Ligand binder design. Structure first.
Ligand code: K
Ligand code: MG
Ligand code: MG
Ligand code: MG
Ligand code: MG
Ligand code: MG
Ligand code: MG
Ligand code: MG
Ligand code: MG
Ligand code: MG
Ligand code: MG
Ligand code: MG
Ligand code: MG
Ligand code: MG
Ligand code: MG
Ligand code: MG
Ligand code: MG
Ligand code: MG
Ligand code: MG
Ligand code: MG
Ligand code: MG
Ligand code: MG
Ligand code: MG
Ligand code: MG
Ligand code: MG
Ligand code: MG
Ligand code: MG
Ligand code: MG
Ligand code: MG
Ligand code: MG
Ligand code: MG
Ligand code: MG
Ligand code: MG
Ligand code: MG
Ligand code: MG
Ligand code: MG
Ligand code: MG
Ligand code: MG
Ligand code: MG
Ligand code: MG
Ligand code: MG
Ligand code: MG
Ligand code: MG
Ligand code: MG
Ligand code: MG
Ligand code: MG
Ligand code: MG
Ligand code: MG
Ligand code: MG
Ligand code: MG
Ligand code: MG
Ligand code: MG
Ligand code: MG
Ligand code: MG
Ligand code: MG
Ligand code: MG
Ligand code: MG
Ligand code: MG
Ligand code: MG
Ligand code: MG
Ligand code: MG
Ligand code: MG
Ligand code: MG
Ligand code: MG
Ligand code: MG
Ligand code: MG
Ligand code: MG
Ligand code: MG
Ligand code: MG
Ligand code: MG
Ligand code: MG
Ligand code: MG
Ligand code: MG
Ligand code: MG
Ligand code: MG
Ligand code: MG
Ligand code: MG
Ligand code: MG
Ligand code: MG
Ligand code: MG
Ligand code: MG
Ligand code: MG
Ligand code: MG
Ligand code: MG
Ligand code: MG
Ligand code: MG
Ligand code: MG
Ligand code: MG
Ligand code: MG
Ligand code: MG
Ligand code: MG
Ligand code: MG
Ligand code: MG
Ligand code: MG
Ligand code: MG
Ligand code: MG
Ligand code: MG
Ligand code: MG
Ligand code: MG
Ligand code: MG
Ligand code: MG
Ligand code: MG
Ligand code: MG
Ligand code: MG
Ligand code: MG
Ligand code: MG
Ligand code: MG
Ligand code: MG
Ligand code: MG
Ligand code: MG
Ligand code: MG
Ligand code: MG
Ligand code: MG
Ligand code: MG
Ligand code: MG
Ligand code: MG
Ligand code: MG
Ligand code: MG
Ligand code: MG
Ligand code: MG
Ligand code: MG
Ligand code: MG
Ligand code: MG
Ligand code: MG
Ligand code: MG
Ligand code: MG
Ligand code: MG
Ligand code: MG
Ligand code: MG
Ligand code: MG
Ligand code: MG
Ligand code: MG
Ligand code: MG
Ligand code: MG
Ligand code: MG
Ligand code: MG
Ligand code: MG
Ligand code: MG
Ligand code: MG
Ligand code: MG
Ligand code: MG
Ligand code: MG
Ligand code: MG
Ligand code: MG
Ligand code: MG
Ligand code: MG
Ligand code: MG
Ligand code: MG
Ligand code: MG
Ligand code: MG
Ligand code: MG
Ligand code: MG
Ligand code: MG
Ligand code: MG
Ligand code: MG
Ligand code: MG
Ligand code: MG
Ligand code: MG
Ligand code: MG
Ligand code: MG
Ligand code: MG
Ligand code: MG
Ligand code: MG
Ligand code: MG
Ligand code: MG
Ligand code: MG
Ligand code: MG
Ligand code: MG
Ligand code: MG
Ligand code: MG
Ligand code: MG
Ligand code: MG
Ligand code: MG
Ligand code: MG
Ligand code: MG
Ligand code: MG
Ligand code: MG
Ligand code: MG
Ligand code: MG
Ligand code: MG
Ligand code: MG
Ligand code: MG
Ligand code: MG
Ligand code: MG
Ligand code: MG
Ligand code: MG
Ligand code: MG
Ligand code: MG
Ligand code: MG
Ligand code: MG
Ligand code: MG
Ligand code: MG
Ligand code: MG
Ligand code: MG
Ligand code: MG
Ligand code: MG
Ligand code: MG
Ligand code: MG
Ligand code: MG
Ligand code: MG
Ligand code: MG
Ligand code: MG
Ligand code: MG
Ligand code: MG
Ligand code: MG
Ligand code: MG
Ligand code: MG
Ligand code: MG
Ligand code: MG
Ligand code: MG
Ligand code: MG
Ligand code: MG
Ligand code: MG
Ligand code: MG
Ligand code: MG
Ligand code: MG
Ligand code: MG
Ligand code: MG
Ligand code: MG
Ligand code: MG
Ligand code: MG
Length: 249
RNA sequence: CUGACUGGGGCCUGUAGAGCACUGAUAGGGCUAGGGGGCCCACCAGCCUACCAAACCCUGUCAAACUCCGAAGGGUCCCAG
RNA sequence: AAGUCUGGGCUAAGUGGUAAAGGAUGUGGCGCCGCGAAGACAGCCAGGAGGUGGCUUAGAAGCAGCCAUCCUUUAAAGAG
RNA sequence: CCUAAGGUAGCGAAAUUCCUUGUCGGGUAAGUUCCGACCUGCACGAAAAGCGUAACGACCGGAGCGCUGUCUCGGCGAGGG
RNA sequence: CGCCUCCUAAAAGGUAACGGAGGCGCCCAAAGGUCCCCUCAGGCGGGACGGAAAUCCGCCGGAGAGCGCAAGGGUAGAAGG
RNA sequence: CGAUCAACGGAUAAAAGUUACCCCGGGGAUAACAGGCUGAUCUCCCCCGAGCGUCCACAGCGGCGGGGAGGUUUGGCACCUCGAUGUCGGCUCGUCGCAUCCUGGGGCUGAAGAAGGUCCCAAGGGUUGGGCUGUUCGCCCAUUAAAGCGGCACGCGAGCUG
RNA sequence: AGCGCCGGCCAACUCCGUGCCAGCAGCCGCGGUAAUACGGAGGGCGCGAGCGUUACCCGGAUUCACUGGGCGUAAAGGGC
RNA sequence: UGAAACUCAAAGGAAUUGACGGGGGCCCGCACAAGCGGUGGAGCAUGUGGUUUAAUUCGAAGCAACGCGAAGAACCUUACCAGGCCUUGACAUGCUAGGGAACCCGGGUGAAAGCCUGGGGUGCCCCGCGAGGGGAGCCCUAGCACAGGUGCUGCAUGGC
RNA sequence: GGCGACACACGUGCUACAAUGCCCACUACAAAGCGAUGCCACCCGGCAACGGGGAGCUAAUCGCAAAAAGGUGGGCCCAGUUCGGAUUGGGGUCUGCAACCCGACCCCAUGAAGCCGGAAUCGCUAGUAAUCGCGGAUCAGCCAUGCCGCGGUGAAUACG
RNA sequence: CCGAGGGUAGGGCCCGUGACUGGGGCGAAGUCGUAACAAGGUAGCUGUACCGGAAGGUGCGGCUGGAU
RNA sequence: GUAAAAUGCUAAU
RNA sequence: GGCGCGUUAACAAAGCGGUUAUGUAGCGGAUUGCAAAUCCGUCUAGUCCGGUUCGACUCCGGAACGCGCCUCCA
C-alpha cells in the first residue's frame, strides 16, 4: 500500500507517433518529480520510437511512501497541441495512459506435505515378474484442490515419487501465477481502460498553457512547471478532496 | 639338538593414549592491517561503532592421509632351558 | 540325577520370564542444607488494606499485552 | 549462429502422446474406453507413400433396440456317468 | 586394468574392498664428474623513477626456502646457489 | 633398433554385431517371485513446549530438535529352493489381528440443545449397488448405522478364470 | 392554459454557463474557452384543451415508369 | 442459378480550373559543370539545444530560428530569483473631510527603499492699516470613482 | 543575485597552423565619416596603458590621423620555431557611486592546442572573389572577432 | 364395415441451439511491407494455372479502360 | 526496339 | 542417477597461457522537410568456490544452471 515502492507503466494511447511523444513527456515529468521527493527511479522495460518517444516505458519509484503519492496519476491523460508530426498547423487531441501498481513479492513456492497424499500401486505395461508385484506407480494428490499427478516413468517408487512431486508443484505454481496475472489484468483495465479521448483524468492544453484535473476541478497554468515535475500542487488538491470525500454520513 | 614355547640381554618401530611445537580445523575474549557502516569532508585529513573480520596474543578444543611426545606389545640376533 | 541346605539383605511387579527417550508422593538405604515450643509443617480462625492503578486502552480501573514495581497506619497488606 | 538443406500440402493425445484419465464438447444417474474438436506432434508427413473413399470383412473399438439363467439367485426336471 | 606417493595397515615385514586422496608413460649435454667458493624463506627500518612484490643497505631470522615435474622421506656440517 | 603387445606376464601376422526362431552343458556358487535377516524407506505412537488459539502453551493444535514400536510399501543383503517354490487382478471360500468405519460404554471440549471435535475401553456382529479401466489403486453416481485398515507364500490356479 | 419549435430544409435571436465534457440528432451535421445547433434565461414563431413523440399505410418516389424510366463509358445486351 | 443478416451516406459517370509526376517539349538562375577562396578538425568569440540552478526572464524553429528581437545586461537596463518595504500607488482625470498648503535646507533609523522626523516661506480680488476672513496655483493625510499589469490568447486583431 | 552556470551537442564567426611568411627600423598613396561635460593638436612625467599641462576648432579652416597592405634596408633558416597566442601568476591604467560574481586596456612572466582538417559542406562571373586597413551607429566603459558602411591592391574560369 | 383418436416403425420440411471453425462488416492509434492511382518507378486490367508471411509474383492467351 | 537506384508521412474546417 | 557438451558484453556467437574477435544493435556526427536505408566514427566482456603457473576468459578440480543421450532382462 501507500508506503511500499510502486511501478508506473506508461503506455501510448490514441495519437500514434504523437501519443508516444506525449508519453515521453509524461515520463520525464515523473522522473523529475521523484528527484524532488528524494525518490529513486530505475527503468525495467522501455520501448522507444525512432522519433524520440516510447510506445511503452515501465519504471519503478524506489523510496518510502511511493505508492502514496503516484497513485493519483493512474488514468488517461489527454494532450491537445499542434504536433511536431503535423504539417498543416492543426491542433490534434491525443492520449497516453499511466498505470501505477505496488511492487509485490516474488514469494517462494513449496509444498505443504500435510495437504498432499501419496498413493502407491502396481504399474501398467511390460515388466514380467517385476511389474506384477512391485509398487512402483505413484499418485500425488493435492488435497485442498484435488489435482493429481501420477508417475510410473521408471521402475523405482522413489524416483517416480520425486518426479511426481516436482510436476505437482510446478503445476500448482502456474495455477498461482495465473490468478495473480488475472488480478494484475482486471486492475490494469480498471486504471487504463480503452485509453480513449474521453475517460480522461487530466488535460494538458499547450495552446492555453493549461493543465486541468477534471476529477476535482483544480487547474494551474504552470504547464512548463507541471511538465518539468512540479506536480505537488495538484497532488495536494486531490489529497484535500480525498479527505472531504471522507465525511461521516 | 638345531624346533615350537620360555628366561636374560642388545638393537629396530610411531599404533593405543595423549598433545598442539608443525599442516589444517576451531568457540569466545584481547589487541589490531583491511573492508561495512560512519558524523562529517575531496580544498587535505580526521573521528566514531554493541558491524564483517587478516595477523598476533589469551582461555577452551578437534584430525586416518597432523605429531613437541609416546607406551603395553611386536620383530630380529646372541647365550641358556 | 543331586539341598524344598545355612546365614544377611532386597523385590509385591509373576518384576524374575524380551525394549528407549522421558514421566512418577512405588519401596528400602545413604547423604546435604533448612524451619521448629525465638511454638515449626498441615488444617482452622483472622487481617490481607490504602494514592486506585504508570502504557494500552470507550471499562482492561489489585484481578490483559507493556515501563518501572515508590510509599502509610506497620505485626502485616505485592498498584498483586 | 549452424547445416548438404532446415518438414511443404495434408493430418494430428493418432494401431503413433511420455507427462495423460491433456483440455473443451457429446453420449451415461455416473464414461481411464468411445465419438467430435483444439494443437507445446516426448517421438505424423507425402510410393518403408500423405489425406480421403462407396462396396466388402468369422479383423479390432464404442452405443442403442429386441431378447434372454449372463446376472440379482437360485429352483426343479431328463438322460450318460 | 601397468607404474609411483600418502592413508587405511592394528609402532618389524606384508596385508583387502567398484575404500579416502594424488601423480607417471617425461626430462637434462648439464639438471652429469671433480675441485673450489657461497647460504635461504620471511619480518621491521632505510632508499630517484619503483608499486604488495624489480634492484641496493642495515638488523632480526635453524630453516618454515630451495631441491625440473605428485607425494613422502631426506637435506644448509648441502642433496640448495 | 622397430611394442598405448596401455586388457601393460604381452592367445593370431590378421577380427564386429544380433537372436522374442533359438539350442546343449551347468548354478540356487548368481538376478527376477515368495519366504528369511535388516528396517534406511513406509505406517503408527511418544518426549520437549517455541508458538497458535481475542484472553489462555496443552479444547483443538506443536517451530527447532529428541526416543521408539510395527514388519503392509520401496530398498539393502544373497541364506533354503534354478534334476521348477506358477507369477497381476477377478471369482469362490473364509479365518485372524486391532493402530476401530459403524453399533455399545466412557473422560475432556472453545459441550446451551441438536450436532460435532479429541482421547480412552471394546474385535460380538456388521461393513450396499452401480459407471470408467485388465487393473490393484483412484475418481464418479445413488444410497447407508457404516460404506474400516491390515496378516494369512501381497491367503486361496492338484478350486475356477486368463 | 397548456404543448411543440426558433443552425439549413422551416416561421421564429440574443445574453450567460459549459469547453469533443455535459449533451442535441429526421438528414447535412452541432459541441475541443466569444456555440442563433448543448442547458437555462429573456425574447420570438406555431397551434391551442390540447401539443408532441413512437409504430404503421399512401404520398412526395416518373425510385417497378400502363398513364410515366432505362441498358457505349453511371446498375444494366445473354460469348455466338 | 443466386439470396439474407449486418453496415455505409454514399458508391458512381462525364467534363472544368488547379496541383503533382522517378511524362514530354522549349526556356532560365553561381543550379550543376569550369574555376578560386573557405566551413566541417584546433584555440578563442558569439548565438542555440541540453543539462544545471532559488532564478539561470522571455520570443525566435528546416530553407525563410541559431553575431536573430539586443544599433552596447556590473547597478540601472530587467521582464527572473531571494530577502526588505508599498497601498487612489511611479502616472492619469474628476468628487467630497482635516488641512489649507506652494518650495528650499537639515535629524534620526535602515543595505537602500521605507518608517518615524524639525526648520521655516505663497500667488487673485478684496473686508484691507482689524484680529486677519474668505475665493486662490499647488501640496499633504480621510475616503472615493480609479489607476497599474513584459499575466494569457500573433488560432480573436491593426500596423510593420 | 541571476540573465555570463558546464558532463555535453549544433549554427555563425575570429585567430592560426607559416618563408609568396614572421620581425625590427626607416619611407609612401585613400575614401567615408565623427567631433562643445565634444575632438584633441603641441609640450612634459611615465617602458606603456595613461597622467598633468595645454593651443585650435560651434568647424573643406582646428582635431580624431598612424591609413594598412605597399616600398627600401637589415634580421630569423624550416624547428611546434622570432610560427601560433590560448591558459595561468604578478604588478599597474581608466570609466563609473560601485568592476567578487562580471568590464576594458597596459607591462612582466607562463607560451597550450594547432603540421591545413573524416563523411560532408558554403560563397563568388570583374573591380567580382581573395587579401588590406579606415569610419560610424548604440555608447560612462565595454566583453565588436558582430552590424552598417568606406577606399586600397586585384585574379582564375564558364566547353557546355 | 367405416370410424375420433391412441400405439408402433420409417421418411420429408422447418425453427431454435452447439465444443470448435470459416471468412465478412465496422475502428479519429498498432505491427509488416508498398500492390494500385503519374510510364506509380517492372503500363494496367483480365480468365486460368502454379507459387509465396502479406499485399502480390510468374507462366499462357485476351483487352485498351495504356504511356511516350 | 525503346529508356527509371531508392520505402514511408496516423489522428481536430 | 550415469555419460558427453556448454556458461563470454545489449543480443547471437568465436579464437587464444600474455593480444580492441565478429555481425546486428546502442552511442556522436553526416545526409534528408522528417523517418528509414545509406555514409564517417565509436564499444561493454568472460557464473561461483579451490588449485597450477611469473601470468588463467583460456589449463586442472569441484559447485550451480542448461542442452544431448541412456535407464535394459526378468
Ligand atoms: K531375451
Ligand atoms: Mg510495446
Ligand atoms: Mg503529414
Ligand atoms: Mg501419511
Ligand atoms: Mg508395477
Ligand atoms: Mg492397458
Ligand atoms: Mg521386453
Ligand atoms: Mg507383447
Ligand atoms: Mg520386489
Ligand atoms: Mg638343546
Ligand atoms: Mg630359536
Ligand atoms: Mg587417538
Ligand atoms: Mg595445531
Ligand atoms: Mg585427537
Ligand atoms: Mg595418529
Ligand atoms: Mg619427553
Ligand atoms: Mg620379542
Ligand atoms: Mg627381544
Ligand atoms: Mg639351545
Ligand atoms: Mg529354605
Ligand atoms: Mg551359618
Ligand atoms: Mg505391572
Ligand atoms: Mg512372569
Ligand atoms: Mg512381564
Ligand atoms: Mg529410587
Ligand atoms: Mg518432427
Ligand atoms: Mg518448403
Ligand atoms: Mg505444395
Ligand atoms: Mg503443417
Ligand atoms: Mg494432438
Ligand atoms: Mg481424448
Ligand atoms: Mg491421426
Ligand atoms: Mg509418435
Ligand atoms: Mg496419453
Ligand atoms: Mg499412458
Ligand atoms: Mg476423466
Ligand atoms: Mg469428457
Ligand atoms: Mg459429457
Ligand atoms: Mg468396456
Ligand atoms: Mg478422437
Ligand atoms: Mg498442448
Ligand atoms: Mg509413417
Ligand atoms: Mg519417419
Ligand atoms: Mg519424396
Ligand atoms: Mg523406403
Ligand atoms: Mg520414401
Ligand atoms: Mg486414414
Ligand atoms: Mg468419392
Ligand atoms: Mg472406409
Ligand atoms: Mg467405406
Ligand atoms: Mg476381410
Ligand atoms: Mg475377417
Ligand atoms: Mg475373405
Ligand atoms: Mg452395445
Ligand atoms: Mg441396451
Ligand atoms: Mg439390450
Ligand atoms: Mg444356471
Ligand atoms: Mg441339477
Ligand atoms: Mg439324471
Ligand atoms: Mg594383470
Ligand atoms: Mg608400467
Ligand atoms: Mg606396518
Ligand atoms: Mg604405515
Ligand atoms: Mg603390526
Ligand atoms: Mg622380507
Ligand atoms: Mg587395495
Ligand atoms: Mg593387491
Ligand atoms: Mg589418472
Ligand atoms: Mg637433477
Ligand atoms: Mg644437482
Ligand atoms: Mg661443475
Ligand atoms: Mg629478505
Ligand atoms: Mg621495504
Ligand atoms: Mg620497496
Ligand atoms: Mg622443505
Ligand atoms: Mg618451481
Ligand atoms: Mg606437478
Ligand atoms: Mg590403446
Ligand atoms: Mg591381460
Ligand atoms: Mg590383445
Ligand atoms: Mg607383477
Ligand atoms: Mg602375437
Ligand atoms: Mg607383424
Ligand atoms: Mg584382438
Ligand atoms: Mg555369432
Ligand atoms: Mg523378434
Ligand atoms: Mg515379433
Ligand atoms: Mg520355428
Ligand atoms: Mg520371425
Ligand atoms: Mg535346436
Ligand atoms: Mg538348458
Ligand atoms: Mg543341464
Ligand atoms: Mg563367481
Ligand atoms: Mg550355498
Ligand atoms: Mg535372488
Ligand atoms: Mg534387487
Ligand atoms: Mg528375487
Ligand atoms: Mg529383488
Ligand atoms: Mg509366493
Ligand atoms: Mg527378494
Ligand atoms: Mg520358501
Ligand atoms: Mg523400526
Ligand atoms: Mg525393528
Ligand atoms: Mg525408519
Ligand atoms: Mg509409543
Ligand atoms: Mg497469544
Ligand atoms: Mg486455556
Ligand atoms: Mg511438526
Ligand atoms: Mg530416532
Ligand atoms: Mg524404531
Ligand atoms: Mg514379512
Ligand atoms: Mg513381507
Ligand atoms: Mg524385503
Ligand atoms: Mg543364495
Ligand atoms: Mg557371502
Ligand atoms: Mg528357481
Ligand atoms: Mg524330480
Ligand atoms: Mg524335486
Ligand atoms: Mg518338477
Ligand atoms: Mg513340484
Ligand atoms: Mg481378510
Ligand atoms: Mg485399542
Ligand atoms: Mg457410543
Ligand atoms: Mg464409538
Ligand atoms: Mg450434545
Ligand atoms: Mg466423546
Ligand atoms: Mg468386532
Ligand atoms: Mg461400493
Ligand atoms: Mg454400460
Ligand atoms: Mg466395473
Ligand atoms: Mg476399477
Ligand atoms: Mg490407476
Ligand atoms: Mg451416525
Ligand atoms: Mg457418512
Ligand atoms: Mg489381498
Ligand atoms: Mg498371492
Ligand atoms: Mg493366488
Ligand atoms: Mg490353472
Ligand atoms: Mg490367480
Ligand atoms: Mg494351490
Ligand atoms: Mg499345485
Ligand atoms: Mg500345490
Ligand atoms: Mg492373454
Ligand atoms: Mg483368451
Ligand atoms: Mg414544430
Ligand atoms: Mg413546417
Ligand atoms: Mg427562418
Ligand atoms: Mg457583456
Ligand atoms: Mg431539444
Ligand atoms: Mg423529424
Ligand atoms: Mg478539448
Ligand atoms: Mg468561458
Ligand atoms: Mg470557437
Ligand atoms: Mg457561449
Ligand atoms: Mg442540435
Ligand atoms: Mg435543432
Ligand atoms: Mg439554445
Ligand atoms: Mg409535393
Ligand atoms: Mg408510384
Ligand atoms: Mg414512402
Ligand atoms: Mg413504360
Ligand atoms: Mg433511369
Ligand atoms: Mg455482343
Ligand atoms: Mg456482360
Ligand atoms: Mg454461358
Ligand atoms: Mg472522371
Ligand atoms: Mg505539368
Ligand atoms: Mg562546384
Ligand atoms: Mg581548407
Ligand atoms: Mg573548418
Ligand atoms: Mg569550430
Ligand atoms: Mg535555457
Ligand atoms: Mg509572449
Ligand atoms: Mg538563417
Ligand atoms: Mg542586449
Ligand atoms: Mg553586445
Ligand atoms: Mg536586473
Ligand atoms: Mg533591480
Ligand atoms: Mg496571423
Ligand atoms: Mg507563438
Ligand atoms: Mg497581422
Ligand atoms: Mg542573452
Ligand atoms: Mg563539433
Ligand atoms: Mg565571432
Ligand atoms: Mg566554426
Ligand atoms: Mg579613431
Ligand atoms: Mg612550444
Ligand atoms: Mg603536437
Ligand atoms: Mg614560439
Ligand atoms: Mg593578471
Ligand atoms: Mg565586472
Ligand atoms: Mg612546418
Ligand atoms: Mg550573376
Ligand atoms: Mg571596425
Ligand atoms: Mg563605445
Ligand atoms: Mg384411421
Ligand atoms: Mg393415426
Ligand atoms: Mg505500389
Ligand atoms: Mg504491378
Ligand atoms: Mg514512392
Ligand atoms: Mg517498385
Ligand atoms: Mg508497377
Ligand atoms: Mg495472370
Ligand atoms: Mg515466382
Ligand atoms: Mg523499365
Ligand atoms: Mg527500398
Ligand atoms: Mg509503416
Ligand atoms: Mg501506411
Ligand atoms: Mg518519397
Ligand atoms: Mg495526410
Ligand atoms: Mg568460449
Ligand atoms: Mg550470450
Ligand atoms: Mg563464427
Ligand atoms: Mg548514429
Ligand atoms: Mg537523421
Ligand atoms: Mg562491435
Ligand atoms: Mg591464478
Ligand atoms: Mg583462478
Ligand atoms: Mg586478461
Ligand atoms: Mg571448469
Ligand atoms: Mg536383451
Amino acid at each position: 500500500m501507500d508506503e511500499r515502492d510502486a511501478i508506473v507503466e506508461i503506455r501510448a494511447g490514441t495519437g500514434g507517433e504523437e501519443a508516444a511523444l506525449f508519453a515521453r513527456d509524461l515520463f520525464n515529468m515523473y522522473l523529475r518529480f521523484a528527484e524532488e521527493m528524494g525518490f529513486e527511479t530505475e527503468v525495467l522495460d522501455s520501448h522507444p520510437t525512432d522519433l524520440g518517444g516510447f510506445s511503452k516505458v515501465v519504471f519503478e519509484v524506489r523510496g518510502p511512501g511511493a505508492y502514496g503519492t503516484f497513485k493519483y496519476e493512474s488514468g488517461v491523460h489527454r494532450v491537445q497541441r499542434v504536433p511536431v508530426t503535423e504539417t498543416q498547423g492543426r491542433i490534434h487531441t491525443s492520449t497516453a495512459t499511466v498505470a501505477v501498481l505496488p511492487k509485490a513479492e516474488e514469494e517462494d513456492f513449496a509444498l505443504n506435505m500435510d495437504e498432499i497424499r501419496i498413493d502407491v500401486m502396481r504399474a501398467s505395461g511390460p515388466g514380467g515378474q517385476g511389474v506384477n508385484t512391485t509398487d512402483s506407480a505413484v499418485r500425488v494428490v493435492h488435497l485442498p484442490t484435488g489435482i493429481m499427478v501420477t508417475c510410473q516413468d521408471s521402475r523405482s517408487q522413489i524416483k517416480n515419487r520425486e518426479k511426481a512431486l516436482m510436476i505437482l508443484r510446478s503445476r500448482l505454481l502456474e495455477m498461482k501465477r495465473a490468478e495473480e496475472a488475472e488480478r494484475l489484468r482486471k486492475t490494469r483495465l480498471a486504471q487504463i481502460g480503452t485509453g480513449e479521448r474521453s475517460e480522461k483524468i487530466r488535460t494538458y492544453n499547450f495552446p492555453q498553457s493549461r493543465v486541468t484535473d477534471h476529477r476535482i476541478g483544480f487547474t494551474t497554468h504552470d504547464l512548463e512547471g507541471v511538465l518539468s515535475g512540479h506536480l505537488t500542487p495538484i497532488l495536494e488538491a486531490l489529497k484535500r478532496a480525498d479527505q472531504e470525500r471522507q465525511l461521516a454520513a
